[PDB]
DNA sequence: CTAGTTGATCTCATATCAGGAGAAGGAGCAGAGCG
C-alpha cells in the first residue's frame, strides 16, 4: 500500500485508484466486528434493514414482530467500541404499529424526513420521521411482500408494491392514488425494485419464476421478460421465459444499473442485462435460498470491483458480480439470514437474521 | 416549423393555422406518444378535437420518428355520421395521407379484408365505425395498428358491450379517445374509457367501483353525512389527480 | 460560517495533455498545452514556441483534441472537463482582440455510473462524424457532430465489455469504427465495433475480437494507407488490420512500459513512444507496395518523463511532462556519440508533484521562501520559489570599496551616458565603458585627488562634479573648468545635492545655494540652521520650467525630515521622527500622482509622504521598515515611470502599482550604491556596486516568482529545515534494479559523506530510501544516510525534544515487504547532524508504518498505522510512550496548535484531538463524520480546520459553537480542481488574517487566508457580479465549477471566495467594471482588489 | 348499375304438548406408555 499512498501523492495514479482499490481491499476484509454492536430491540427476526441514502447515518429495521426500529450508526461516543443505539422505535405500544411482520422498510430517497414500511398486515404506511406518526396508509387486499421507492426519481414518487396478488400496485405518494396496477404476473410478487438508472423502469419478480421489467409510464405491459436460456428453449410465451426454476424471490440492480441480479429458489443467482434482459451466463455456483418470502440482498458501491452480498442460509456469501468468484462467506449468524444492507461510505455491511440480531461486518484493520 | 422535445417537428403553416389551445393539444398528444400512453381529448365540443388529431398525426408522419418509420397504419373509429367528415378533414388539412373508409358506402368496392390488408401494408388511415369494429375484431386485430383513435369514444362507455371489448382488443399503446363528455352517468363509464386508453391506471373494475364510485357517489346525495361528503371529496381529488395527465379537457 | 479567500500564487505547471494542429489559423501550426485548468496556445515558429493566448478553463481539462468538421476553415477544439463539461471551442482573432468562442457546450455527466478505471477517454472520429467518450464502465457516450448541435446532446451505447483499457477510432472505414482493448477473465482482447448514429447502437466490427498480450494498454489508430491499429503491450507491439497480424517483441521496450505516443507523419510511417523511464522510442512502419511489411522500434534517447508528447516539425518534439520539466527537444538524424538523437532545445519549469514543502526565511530577510520537494523518479528536485526582481550580471569589474556611481555622457552629442564615475576614498576614477568593454580612461576637468560626493550631466551642455573640497562645472565639448566655486572658509562640503540646473550643498550647520549659468557658477541663497545637515534633495520633478521649487533637509540632534522653500531656505515644515539615529538619505520623487518624499533612518525605517507643490507640508506620515543597514535612495526611470531603488543588505525596488506603493525585493546579496545607465551597449540598465565589485545588469520588473532548481535525480518525499544546523533534511527515494544497482547517479549517491543504517531491530526493482542533509546556502548534499534494506522513510521532522538542547532529525519509517498490504514493522530513528556527520542518537521499533510525526509541545507525536501515540524524550535520550489513541482507520496527517491535534484520516477525514496535560491522555474533542478521503490538512485558527479531500476539494471544518458537540461542522466547501499534497503556514511577501500556502500534484501553489465577515460579504457580491459579467471559455458556470464535488455528494461552494475570479476584476475594461459595480464606486473596488493581490 | 325502401335482426341504453330409534361427532376424561 505505501505504494498507493506514494502514487497518490505523486500523481502517478488518479486518486480514484486509491479510493476504489482501497475500497475493494476493505470489502475483502469484512469481518464480524465484535468491536461494534447493534442494540437488540426486535423480539422477532429482522426482515429488512435500510441505511439512508443521504449521509448514511441512520438505519431502519423491520421485525417479524412488527416493530420498526431506527438506529444511529455513528459512533458518537469517544470510545473505539460502541453500540449503534436505537434512536426511535415503532413499538408494540405505538398506535400505528404494524400488526404483523414488517416486511420492508425504506427511507424516502432524497430526504431523510419520511420513510415507508409495509407489512403482512396488508398495509404500506408512510411515516414522518420526525414526529414518527403515519402520514398516509395504503391498504392492500393481500399481504405485502415488498415495496420499493425509486432511488432516482426526482419526478415521480411511486412506490411499487408486491403482494400475494398477482398484480403490482403503484402507489403515488403525491396525491395518493393506489389504483395503478401492472398486470402480467401470475402468482405472488416476491420482489420489486426500481432501476437506479432509469426513472420509470421497475423490475418485478414473482413466484411464477418469471421476472419482468416494466416501464410504468408505458401503457402496454412489460418491456422484457428474463429468460434463462436466451432462446435456446424458445416457445410462444405462455409459460416459458422463466428466469429461474423455482420462485424468484430477490432482485437487485447493480450499482450503475446496467445489470440485474435475481436469486430464486432453484438455488441460483443470475446476472441479467437490464437493457435487453439477456443472460450474461455468470455462474456464481449454488446459492442456497429457500426463503418463502422476499430475500433482500445488496451490491457494493464505489469499489474497484462490484460485489454482491447474498444471504446464504445463516451466512452472507460475497461474490464478485461480473465474474462470479465467491469472495468469502461471512459466518456469524445463528439462524437464516434475511437481509443484508451495505454502507457505502465505509464498506460496512449490516445483516439481520431470524435470530433477532443485526450483525455489523466492518473491514479488518 | 414548430419543434418539441425529441424529434417532433410539425410544419409551420399547419401550426400557424392552429390556435394556442390546439397547439397545446398537439404537444400533449406527442408527450403521450413519448410515454406510450393513451389519452382522452375531452375538449368541449365545437372547440375542434379533430383538428388537433390531424395536426399531431401530420407532424408525426412528417417528422419521420423512429418498427415504424414515422406513422404506421392507423385506424379511426368514429360514429357512422361523421366518417366522410373525417375524410374531408384529412384531405384538406393534410392531403398526403391515404384515408380509406371502411363502410358499405366506402370507396373500395371489393372485399373489405383486402382493404384492411391494403391499409396495413401501405400505412394509410383506415376510418371505420364502431359496428365494423365489433363485427371484425378478428380481421382488424391482426395488423399491428399504430394508432387507434376513437372519435366520440364515449360509445365504449359500457365495459361489457361487445364494441367495448372489440375496441379493447387492439394492442398498440397509442390509443386515443376524442369524447366531448367522457362521463355521462356514473364513473363506471369513466373507468371504461380509461381502461381503453390506459389499461391499468384505474385498477380493475371492481376495485374502481369499491374505491371510487361508491364514495364519490355517496357524497352527492342530499342526506349524506358530512363525513361521507369529505370522503367523496378526497376520492374525487385523488381521481382527478390520477386522471390528470391523460385527460385534456378544455 | 468561515470566510476564506483562495488564490493561485503559482498556476499549475504540469502538462496533463498537449495537441498540435491548425487552431489559430489554417496556416499556423499550434501547440495547445493543457495544464490542469489552463489551456496554453502557442504558435510553432521555426524556433521555439510563441505564446499567443492562455485561457483559464472552469474545469480540469480531461480531454483536449482538435478536429476539423467539413467546410470549416481551421481546427475546432473539443475539451471535456473532469466534471464532464464538454465544449467545442473555435479561435477567432479580430485584429488585436482575441476570443475563444464556444461553438457548443454541455454537461455529459451521467447521474450514475462507475467511472472507468483507466480514466476519461475522449476520441474523435477521423472524419469528425462523432465524439466518442468513455466515461463510465459499460457505457460509451457518443456526441454527434453531423447533427450540428449547440448543446452537445449525447447518447449512450451499451458496451458489452465493462473493462475497456483504451479505445480509438479506426481510419479508412466507411462507418465510424472503434477499436478497443478490454480485459475479461480470459485475458485481454482487442475488439472493434461500428457506430451507427442512425440506429444509435454498435454493429459487428470489421475484424473480430483477437486475443492480445496480457498487458496491452495502448491502441494506435494508423492512418489510411495502412489502416488497422497498433496495440502496444509491455513485451510486444502488434499490428492488426483484420487479416494482417504483424507482431514484434523488441527487447528494448521490456524494461519500462510505454505510456504515450504521437504520430510523427501524416501517413503513420513513424511514431514516437514515451515510456515511464523517460526513454523515447521511434516506431517505424515499413510499407510494401500499400500494406505494412514489418515493425521496428529504435531508441532515440532520453527525455523528461513524458505524459504527452507531440511532434511539431523539423525534428522538434514537445515532451510534455507531469513529473518533470516539460521539454522541447530536437531529433537529430545522426546519433550524439552517446547513442542518443534527442537534444534538448528548451525546458519549461514544472513544479512537479509537490509532495512536501517548507517555508524558510532563508537569507535572514523578512521574506518567506518556499522550498519544495518537486518532481519524481528521475525528475525529482528541490525547487526554491521566491518573489523578487531579477537582473543579469553582464558587466563586472572588481574594484574594492566603491563609494560612488554616476552616469556621464562623455560624447556630448549623444543623450546616452557613456561614462561612469566612481569615488572610493579621496579620489575619482572614471570608466570609459565603451561598448560592452570596461576600462578606466580619464576625461578632462575632473580631479584624481579628491573624493566626489556627486557628479553628472547638467544643462548648458555642461558636466558637474562636486568634490569633498569644492565644486567643478566643466564645459563638456571645449575644455576643462571655466567655472569653480569653493567655500569661503574652504571647509570641506559635508553634505551635497544637485540636479541638472542648480546645486545645493551643505557646509556643516549652514547651507549654500548655487545655480548653474553657462560657463559660470552663481551663488544666491544662504542659511544658518540649528544643527548639522544630514541629507538633502532638490530634484526638479514635473519641473516644466527649468528649476526645482523645493528642498528637504534632515538635521542632527533634532531628528526631522524638514522642508525648505528653495529661493529662501525658509522653514515650510518641521516634522520630527524620533530615535537617536541621523537620517542618512532623503529623496523626493513622483509615483504616478504627485511629489512624494522618502526619508529613512539608519535602521531601514522609511516614511513616504504626500508632498504639495505650493505648501510642501508633510502629512500622511506612514512608516515601513526595510533592512537593518543605513540606506540610500536613487531613482531609475523605466519605460513606464520613476522606479526608486533602495540600497542595503536587502536591496529593494520601490514603485507604485495601481496607485498603491509596492516594496519589491531584489534577489541580490548586497548593493552599496546604484545608478541608472543607458549605454549604446547597455539599454536602461542598472549599475549596482557592492563592497567587492561593480555589478551591472537590467531588471524586467514583472515581479515574477523566481524558481531555482536543485536536481536530485531521485524522488524527494519530505523536507524540513533545521535552522541551528543550516541545512535541509530531505527524504529521498531512488529505484535500484538487481545485490542491487543504481540506474543512475542520484543526489544520494553523490553526497560529500554517506552512511547506511546498521540497526539491530529487524533481522525486479526495489526502492532505496536515504536521508539527505542539504546545505541551505549551496544546496549541496552534505550527507546521505541510507536506510535499512526494504525500509521506506515516510515522515521526517526536525525538532528538539524534551529538555535537551540538541535539534534532531527524526525519521519515521516502515518495513515494506511484498508479502503484505500494510507494513507491520517500522521504527522512529533520531538523527543529529553535527560536524558534517549524521549520528543515530536513538531508535524505536514500532509495530507499523509511521506515516506522520509532528513535534508536539516538547514531545514527539507519531501516527503508527491506525494509532496516534505521543512519545516523550527521556533524559536517557530514548522515546517513551505517554499516550495512545486508536479510533482511526489510518492516521495519515497530523497537525498541531497548542494542546490540540488535528488528525487527517485515510477516509474518516478529520479528528480534533486534545492532549489534556493534567491527566496525560488524549481526548477526542470533535470529529467530522463525513467520509472524505484526505490528501492534507491544516489548522487555520483555534477552531477552523482546513482539509483537502482526494476529490480535489477544500473544506473547512469548525468545532460547533451535548454529544452532538463532538461533531465538527463543515462550514466551508470549495472545489479546487487540484490535489493538495501539503499545507504550510507562511507567506512569500513581506484585510486578511493568516496565510496558508499549499502545493499540489499539478504544481499549483495556492494561498488560503481568513477574511472578515464584511469583506467576505462584499467579495461574494462581486463574485456574483463577475459571474454575471465575465464569460467563461466553455460557458461553464463558476458556481458549478467551484461546487464541492464527490462521487457520492455534490454541494455548492460556501465560505470560500475564488481569489482568481476576484483578481480578474482588474483585467476588464471600465464599462464592464461599471456593469459589475451597479449597486460603492468602482475605484473603491479597484483599491480593494489591489490590496487583495498584495498577499501573494 | 344505383339509390330508396323495407324487413329482420342485432346491439345498446335507459332505472331503483303424546315420536322413536339408531347412527355420527364431539367433548371430557382416565389412564397408559414413554421420552
From Swiss-Prot, chain A:
Q: Which InterPro entries match?
A: G-protein_beta_WD-40_rep, Rad28/ERCC8/Ckn1/ATCSA-1, WD40/YVTN_repeat-like_dom_sf, WD40_repeat_CS, WD40_repeat_dom_sf, WD40_rpt
Q: Which GO terms describe its cellular component?
A: Cul4-RING E3 ubiquitin ligase complex; Cul4A-RING E3 ubiquitin ligase complex; nuclear matrix; nucleoplasm; nucleotide-excision repair complex; nucleus; perikaryon; protein-containing complex
**Which pathway does it take part in?**
Protein modification; protein ubiquitination
Q: Name one GO biological process term.
A: single strand break repair
Q: What does this protein do?
A: Substrate-recognition component of the CSA complex, a DCX (DDB1-CUL4-X-box) E3 ubiquitin-protein ligase complex, involved in transcription-coupled nucleotide excision repair (TC-NER), a process during which RNA polymerase II-blocking lesions are rapidly removed from the transcribed strand of active genes. Following recruitment to lesion-stalled RNA polymerase II (Pol II), the CSA complex mediates ubiquitination of Pol II subunit POLR2A/RPB1 at 'Lys-1268', a critical TC-NER checkpoint, governing RNA Pol II stability and initiating DNA damage excision by TFIIH recruitment.
Subunit structure comment from the entry = Part of the CSA complex (also named DCX(ERCC8) complex), a DCX E3 ubiquitin-protein ligase complex containing ERCC8, RBX1, DDB1 and CUL4A; the CSA complex interacts with RNA polymerase II; upon UV irradiation it interacts with the COP9 signalosome and preferentially with the hyperphosphorylated form of RNA polymerase II. Interacts with ERCC6/CSB (via CIM motif); promoting recruitment to lesion-stalled RNA polymerase II (Pol II). Interacts with KIAA1530/UVSSA. Interacts with a subunit of RNA polymerase II TFIIH.
Could you identify this protein by its name?
Answer: DNA excision repair protein ERCC-8
Task: Look up and give the organism this protein is from.
Answer: Homo sapiens
Swiss-Prot record, chain B:
Indicate where this protein resides in the cell: Nucleus; Chromosome
Superkingdom, taxonomy of origin = Eukaryota
Where, by residue number, does ATP bind? 43-50
Known post-translational modifications? Phosphorylation at these two sites promotes the intramolecular interaction of the N-terminal domain with the helicase ATP-binding domain, thereby probably releasing the inhibitory effect of the N-terminal domain on its ATPase activity. Phosphorylation is essential for its chromatin remodeling activity.
Q: Where is the Helicase ATP-binding domain?
A: 30-200
Q: Which cysteines are joined by disulfide bonds?
A: none
How does this protein assemble?
Homodimer. Binds DNA. Interacts with ERCC8. Interacts with RNA polymerase II; interaction is enhanced by UV irradiation. Component of the B-WICH complex, at least composed of SMARCA5/SNF2H, BAZ1B/WSTF, SF3B1, DEK, MYO1C, ERCC6, MYBBP1A and DDX21. Interacts with KIAA1530/UVSSA. Interacts with ELOA and CUL5; the interaction is induced by DNA damaging agents or by inhibitors of RNA polymerase II elongation. Interacts (via WHD region) with RIF1. Interacts with SMARCC2/BAF170, SMARCB1/BAF47 and the neuron-specific chromatin remodeling complex (nBAF complex).
Free-text note regarding domains: The CSA-interacting motif (CIM) mediates interaction and recruitment of ERCC8/CSA.
Spell out the protein name for this chain: DNA excision repair protein ERCC-6
From Swiss-Prot, chain C:
Describe the PTM: Phosphorylated by ABL1. Ubiquitinated by CUL4A. Subsequently degraded by ubiquitin-dependent proteolysis.
Q: Which residues carry this modification: N-acetylserine?
A: 2
This protein's pathway = Protein modification; protein ubiquitination
The family database entries (SUPFAM superfamilies) matched by this protein are listed as: WD40 repeat-like
Q: Where is this region: Interaction with CDT1 and CUL4A?
A: 762-1096
GO molecular function term, any single one: ubiquitin ligase complex scaffold activity
What positions are modified (N6-acetyllysine)? 1035
- Annotated region described as WD repeat beta-propeller C, given as residue ranges: 704-1011
| InterPro entries per UniProt | Beta-prop_RSE1/DDB1/CPSF1_1st (IPR018846), Cleavage/polyA-sp_fac_asu_C (IPR004871), RSE1/DDB1/CFT1/CPSF1 (IPR050358), WD40/YVTN_repeat-like_dom_sf (IPR015943), WD40_repeat_dom_sf (IPR036322)
Record keyword Glycosyltransferase present: no
Q: Which GO terms describe its cellular component?
A: chromosome, telomeric region; Cul4-RING E3 ubiquitin ligase complex; Cul4A-RING E3 ubiquitin ligase complex; Cul4B-RING E3 ubiquitin ligase complex; cytoplasm; extracellular exosome; extracellular space; nucleolus
Its subcellular locations are: Cytoplasm; Nucleus
Please name the disease the record associates with this protein.
White-Kernohan syndrome: An autosomal dominant disorder characterized by global developmental delay, variably impaired intellectual development, hypotonia, and characteristic facial features. Some patients may have genitourinary and skeletal abnormalities.
What family does the database annotate?
Belongs to the DDB1 family.
Q: What does this protein do?
A: Protein, which is both involved in DNA repair and protein ubiquitination, as part of the UV-DDB complex and DCX (DDB1-CUL4-X-box) complexes, respectively. Core component of the UV-DDB complex (UV-damaged DNA-binding protein complex), a complex that recognizes UV-induced DNA damage and recruit proteins of the nucleotide excision repair pathway (the NER pathway) to initiate DNA repair. The UV-DDB complex preferentially binds to cyclobutane pyrimidine dimers (CPD), 6-4 photoproducts (6-4 PP), apurinic sites and short mismatches.
Q: This chain belongs to which protein, by name?
A: DNA damage-binding protein 1
Q: Which organism is it from?
A: Homo sapiens
